């Protein structure tokens, strides 16, 4: 009686929701699709792959569309030997944990707050004086309550043996820059720092790229274990056509253009960290000093094979694809107040920004975007259009956590900040907002950074700003162009 | 002036995106739906439930559709007593940690690499010699750099007291096989190993089945804590009709067919691990030896009640549902080169494969798909159609991590490999690609496994291959059939 | 086989489309394939040590 009465208890308001219902929950409807197949094919680079060099590949035409694209990287296992035991000790310098430049830079900021005879003190007494000076510095700069000295003395249990390892997220770090080219024109460009920021914000829970890029979430012991043997990494290249099947790049519609991936590789000296400064780093299998020619890479592409009728239709009329392109503003930081002039073009969906200390970069911690003592490097930021506040001054947590909560699949674990003009900037096919920067005379991101950011040992810290913008790729008569 | 100018700054390209806009972001539109209610009802098995037996239930007709289905399992708490203190010590044998068959099998592979007097050595000296021999084995087989001996000596802090526990993910392990039957015909079949693989790949972040199936992510101390008291598990049965409301099984349209769930239960000896070989395992409440009749299970079904008009429409014309069925190829492995002949039928969406060492199975670690020393058991795999490479030789990481990244909600924490012909194999209502195996004369999965896989103590290791295939379930005149 | 002796005798697969072509091989017994230095030796697979 009650359940039937609920179906009868309808009024004029229910008519807007349920009158002439076009859907039922109790019967499945499905759509028929055209026939297609997927094939994954690995392809060698056209030029030699080496650390610090640029390499390119011309993408083969082994199907009708191009869907997924992965850079397959093979890194050798690492071993170490004392320089005294080596017949040829001359190698490039690597970052070493006995010379922690990041910890030395952090100590340099607290030196003015050390009370007593620091120079003559025992090692254990120096560690105590540094921890007390950190409390005095943080009280003076941040009105922080002092932490117990014992809580600041975190011994990272480092192993009592010699090692070397590939840096955190080495699969991204290796790709300093990649360019997707069609007919000799650059269609899009991606950077190591952008790839990491995109994975932090858009990386879905349970599908994080951890193993696929050599990322351990800053657990040095896991990087050491992984680095003792050969590593095979599959780094996704997040081009517009890899984001949705309807955006797959129509190879058949671009028949008269070569499709190329160009990759600028990281220098070998930046890719490795060692336990001690006096160690030589060896290729674990070959027992020779590690060299720039030990980098191996290939391109793994997923091709789509279409039925003849769909292939012929796509060849006759591929039309236009909405694309997202990436733009970069890279700036050196030498002061706590920084203004970035964002000379980006087109309808910008969103931008990301973050800072890297010189000391973190020099320590080989390339994706450590933290400030001094691991703090947030940004105090506040403001966004100006033509000297008018588009976003008034907001604290770092608003740009990092509130923007990520509103617009992104994930909140960043590092100090990555974002701002979206789009309601859904991760939707590759549905435009949901933008600001046209080609119609603004000035776009300025004004930053107030933490105290002493870009001073002394951190002179030439880096500001990264990346923007995502809409453009249109047009296919006509076997040619493709922006 | 700027924001109004952006709305006016439109050209012929914007017309394809925004001309005659059929959607606004500033006004919600909603659809009205028909009236329905959901009811969860628990039902006993029609036959006795016991370990190692087969049991069935005829599903009641308590609503118009059948939606969710959970196997509700009740396991008793476990206690242990010394065999010497027990009036009836005769029980089935259980795996025991004082007789670690998996560790003994791993030691057997490194015996040829032990230098010195192993037989006469002290226990601590034997552990050192085994860790050194592991380095020599891994250097010889994999060109691995040696790990410090202290880093290989992981003491799992096992408690200094007697215990027994239910094996990891016991809720899946208990279900050796389940069959969904309609009118005496098997509509679909699921296996323990498939349920685990499906949860690894399709299990969403924050909705993993951990507690609901007795899974701890291989933390033995948590399995021990849970096993001291009665456990109630709710194991989801992932039938086609549980995946989307429009696929709910139309009970009213199948009025003349009995709907049955058949379950083949795991043997009790495989479900329990104990600290020591000389312990008797007791039911914690009853203080009697644990026996095959201590398994309790019931079926929890979610029924849908429809409004009379929708019920009558569905009874008159339920039509056809697209269904996904599961197929299995199960093979013994006795060599490092394995060819699996996949005699699957219908349009296959995707397949999963993985290996289990005999030693891991015998140790009661039923979902440990790792190789020797916890390594990846697959070096490479190739997929052939009619002796032509459909997927050329690819390394294990491509089949495990790249395929999961492209097509699945999650990456597996265990050595589960997949391959999809579908762009969205987790979409239950939208076909997005398949390969029709009923039109292929041969489908071969060729595997190169790690060295010594399936040799000696691992003779009769297991290969599992599961496929997901499309079929159609038809409803006509109160009957249902494939 | 006759078709391996001269190019003009190559077996015309296209002309035999409705017949399966099969090679059947009867293998020698393992006991006949091996000779050893001494009667009291066990013969092992060199790689597998079985």
- Report the candidate in A172, A61, A212 with the shortest Cα–Cα distance to residue B399: A212
* DSSP notation for A62-89: -SSEEEEEEEEEEE--EEEEEGGG-SS-
Tokens 């197949």 identify what position?
A: A37
Partner residues linked to B65 by β-bridges: B250, B304
Nearest residue of chain A to residue B146 (CA atoms) = A228
Give the number of other CB atoms < 10 A from CB of residue B58: 14
Per-residue buried b or exposed e for B125-164, using 16+ beta carbons within 10 Å of the residue's own CB: eeebbbbbbbbebbeeebbbbbbebeebeeeeeeeeeebb
* 8 Å CB contact of B112 and C49: yes
Residue in A16, A208, A322 nearest the CB of B32? A16
- Helices vs strands, H then E, count in chain B: 13, 24
Look up residue A107 and give its two tokens.
């100590």
Tokens 């659809």 identify what position?
A: B31
* DSSP notation for A461-473: EEEEEEEEEEEEE
Angle between helices B101-110 and B123-142 (to 10 degrees): 60
CA distance A191 to A330: 11
Contacts of C48 in chain B (CB under 8 A): 452, 455
* DSSP notation for B404-473: HHHH-SS--SSS-EEEESSS-TT-SSS----EEGGG-S-EEEEEEEPTTTTSGGGTTEEEEEEEEEEEEE
Tell whether the torsion through CA atoms of A280, A283, A288 and A290 is positive or negative: negative
- Report the candidate in A428, A37, A40, A468 with the shortest Cα–Cα distance to residue A234: A40
CA distance B320 to B244: 15
Exposed / middle / buried, residue B366 (Cβ in 10 Å: 0-12, 13-18, 19+): buried
Chains that touch A (3 or more CB pairs under 8 A): B
* 8 Å CB contact of B204 and A209: no
- Report the candidate in B345, B324, B6 with the shortest Cα–Cα distance to residue B188: B324
Residue B217 · residue B367 · CB < 8 Å: no
Q: Mapping DSSP to helix (H, G, I), strand (E, B) and coil, where does residue B42 land?
A: strand
Mutation for testing the B interface, residue in A7, A206, A407 having most B CBs under 10 Å? A206
- The pair phi, psi for residue B419, each rounded to 5°, is -150, 130
Look up residue B183 and give its two tokens.
């009118």
* 8 Å CB contact of B420 and A212: no
Do the chains C and A touch each other, judged by at least 3 C-beta pairs below 8 angstroms?
no
Mutation for testing the A interface, residue in B6, B35, B408 having most A CBs under 10 Å? B35
CA distance A236 to A234: 6
* DSSP notation for A405-428: HHH-SS--SSS-EEEESSS-TT-S
For B119-187, give the secondary structure using H, E and C.
CCCCHHHHHHHHHHHHHHHHHHHHCCCCCCHHHHCCCCCCCCCCCEEECCCHHHHCEEEEEEEECCEEE
Contacts of B112 in chain C (CB under 8 A): 49
Please count the residues of chain B. Answer: 482
Q: How much is the CA Rg of chain C, to the nearest whole Å? A: 21
Question: Which residues, at least 6 apart from A151, have a Cβ–Cβ distance to it below 8 Å?
Answer: none
- Helices vs strands, H then E, count in chain C: 0, 0
Look up residue B202 and give its two tokens.
């399709």
Write down the H helix ranges in A215-291.
220-227
Give the number of other CB atoms < 10 A from CB of residue B209: 20
Contacts of B455 in chain C (CB under 8 A): 48, 50
Residue B53 · residue B265 · CB < 8 Å: yes
Contacts of B456 in chain C (CB under 8 A): 50
Contacts of A229 in chain B (CB under 8 A): 142-145
Do the chains A and B touch each other, judged by at least 3 C-beta pairs below 8 angstroms?
yes
Beta strands B259-265; B175-182: pairing state: antiparallel
Residue in B32, B246, B409 nearest the CB of A18? B32
State how far residue C34 is from chain B, nearest Cα, in angstroms. 22
* 8 Å CB contact of A230 and B143: yes
Q: Mapping DSSP to helix (H, G, I), strand (E, B) and coil, where does residue A455 land?
A: coil
Residue in A161, A206, A423 nearest the CB of B148? A161
Please count the residues of chain C. Answer: 50
CA angle B27, B28, B34 (to 5 degrees): 150
Widest distance between CA atoms in chain A: 93
Breaks (C-N over 2.5 A) in chain C follow: none
* DSSP notation for B62-85: -SSEEEEEEEEEEE--EEEEEGGG
Angle between helices A123-142 and A101-110 (to 10 degrees): 60
Look up residue A67 and give its two tokens.
């869907």
* 8 Å CB contact of B405 and A207: yes
* 8 Å CB contact of C50 and B456: yes
End-to-end CA distance of chain B: 65
CA distance A40 to B403: 10
Mutation for testing the A interface, residue in B143, B348, B378, B399 having most A CBs under 10 Å? B143
Nearest residue of chain B to residue C50 (CA atoms) = B456
Question: Which residues, at least 6 apart from A329, have a Cβ–Cβ distance to it below 8 Å?
Answer: A340, A341, A342, A343, A344, A463, A464, A465, A466, A467
CA distance A74 to A232: 5
Resolution expressed in Å: 18.0
Nearest residue of chain B to residue A306 (CA atoms) = B433
Tokens 């007097």 identify what position?
A: B117
- Report the candidate in A450, A480, A433, A466 with the shortest Cα–Cα distance to residue A177: A466
CA distance B193 to B368: 10
- The pair phi, psi for residue A313, each rounded to 5°, is -60, -45
Beta strands A443-449; A78-82: pairing state: unpaired
Contacts of A245 in chain B (CB under 8 A): 423, 432
Nearest residue of chain C to residue B335 (CA atoms) = C48
* DSSP notation for B314-348: HHH---EEEEEEEEEEEEEE-SSEEEEE----SEE
Question: Which residues, at least 6 apart from C23, have a Cβ–Cβ distance to it below 8 Å?
Answer: none
- The pair phi, psi for residue B386, each rounded to 5°, is 50, 45
Mutation for testing the B interface, residue in A1, A25, A26, A246 having most B CBs under 10 Å? A26
Residue A380 · residue A183 · CB < 8 Å: no
Per-residue buried b or exposed e for A378-412, using 16+ beta carbons within 10 Å of the residue's own CB: bbbbbbbbeeeebeeebebeebbeebbeebbebeb
Does residue B134 come out as left (phi exceeding 0), alpha (psi in the -120 to 50 range) or beta? Answer: alpha
| CB pairs A-B closer than 8 Å | 184
Per-residue buried b or exposed e for A44-77, using 16+ beta carbons within 10 Å of the residue's own CB: ebeeebbbbeebebebeeebbbbbbbbbbbebbb
Nearest residue of chain B to residue A78 (CA atoms) = B145
| CB pairs B-C closer than 8 Å | 5
Give whole-number Cα distances, B219 to A90, A352, B119, B192, B216, in Å: 47, 39, 33, 20, 6
* DSSP notation for B341-378: E----SEEEEEEEEEE-HHHHHTT-TT----GGG--SE
CA distance C45 to C47: 6
Question: Which residues, at least 6 apart from A124, have a Cβ–Cβ distance to it below 8 Å?
Answer: none
Give the number of other CB atoms < 10 A from CB of residue A128: 16
Give the number of other CB atoms < 10 A from CB of residue B233: 23
Per-residue buried b or exposed e for A196-221, using 16+ beta carbons within 10 Å of the residue's own CB: bbbbbbbbeebbbbbbbbbbbeeebe
CA distance B208 to A206: 10
Does residue A78 come out as left (phi exceeding 0), alpha (psi in the -120 to 50 range) or beta? Answer: beta
State how far residue B321 is from chain A, nearest Cα, in angstroms. 6
- Report the candidate in B230, B216, B270, B198 with the shortest Cα–Cα distance to residue B73: B230
Nearest residue of chain B to residue A305 (CA atoms) = B433
State how far residue C22 is from chain B, nearest Cα, in angstroms. 16
Which technique?
A: cryo-EM
* 8 Å CB contact of B9 and A225: no
């Amino acid at each position: 009686a009650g359940s039937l009465t609920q179906l009868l208890a309808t009024g004029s308001m229910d008519a807007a929701l349920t009158q002439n219902a076009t859907r039922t929950f109790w019967k499945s409807s499905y759509q028929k699709h055209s026939l297609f197949a997927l094939e994954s094919i690995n392809q060698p680079f056209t030029t030699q792959v080496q650390f610090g060099a640029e390499s390119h590949i011309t993408v083969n035409r082994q199907g009708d569309l191009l869907s997924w694209m992965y850079l397959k990287i093979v890194l050798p296992g690492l071993k170490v030997q004392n320089q005294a035991d080596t017949v040829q000790p001359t190698q490039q310098s690597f970052a070493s944990l006995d010379n922690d430049v990041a910890a030395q830079a952090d100590v340099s900021h607290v030196l003015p707050y050390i009370e007593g005879a620091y120079t003559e003190a025992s090692l254990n007494t120096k560690e105590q004086l540094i921890a007390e000076a950190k409390n005095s510095y943080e009280a003076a700069k941040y009105n922080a309550a002092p932490l117990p000295v014992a809580a600041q003395m975190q011994s990272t249990e480092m192993p009592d043996f010699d090692y070397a390892y590939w840096t955190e997220a080495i699969g991204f770090h290796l790709i300093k820059r990649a360019e997707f080219k069609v007919g000799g024109a650059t269609i899009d460009t991606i950077w190591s720092e952008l790839l990491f920021a995109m994975e932090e914000l858009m990386g879905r829970a349970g599908r994080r790229l951890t193993e696929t890029i050599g990322r351990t979430l800053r657990r040095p012991t896991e990087l050491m274990k992984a680095s003792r043997q050969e590593q095979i990494l599959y780094v996704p290249l997040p081009w517009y056509f890899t984001k949705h099947p309807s955006l797959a790049f129509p190879l058949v519609a671009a028949t008269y253009h070569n499709i190329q991936l160009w990759v600028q590789w990281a220098q070998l000296n930046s890719c490795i960290i060692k336990s001690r400064s006096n160690l030589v780093v060896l290729h674990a299998e070959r027992n020779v000093p590690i060299s720039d020619d030990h980098l191996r890479a290939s391109l793994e592409c997923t091709y789509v094979h279409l039925e003849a009728a769909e292939r012929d239709a796509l060849t006759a009329n591929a039309g236009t694809q909405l694309i997202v392109q990436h733009q970069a503003h890279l700036q050196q930081v030498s002061s706590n107040n920084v203004t970035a002039r964002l000379n980006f073009n087109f309808p910008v969906l969103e931008f990301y920004y973050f800072l890297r200390r010189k000391a973190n970069k020099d320590a080989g911690d390339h994706f450590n975007f933290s400030g001094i003592g691991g703090r947030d490097p940004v105090v506040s930021a403001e966004l100006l259009f033509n000297n008018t506040a588009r976003v008034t001054q907001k604290p770092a947590v608003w740009w990092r956590a509130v923007q990520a909560l509103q617009f992104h699949s994930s909140a960043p674990l590092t100090n990555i900040y974002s701002y979206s003009f789009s309601l859904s900037p991760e939707d590759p096919i549905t435009p949901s907002g933008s600001a046209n920067f080609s119609r603004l005379d000035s776009v300025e991101l004004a930053l107030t950074l933490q105290d002493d950011f870009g001073a002394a040992h951190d002179a030439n810290s880096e500001l990264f700003v990346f923007a995502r913008s809409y453009n249109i790729l047009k296919f006509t008569n076997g040619l493709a162009g922006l």
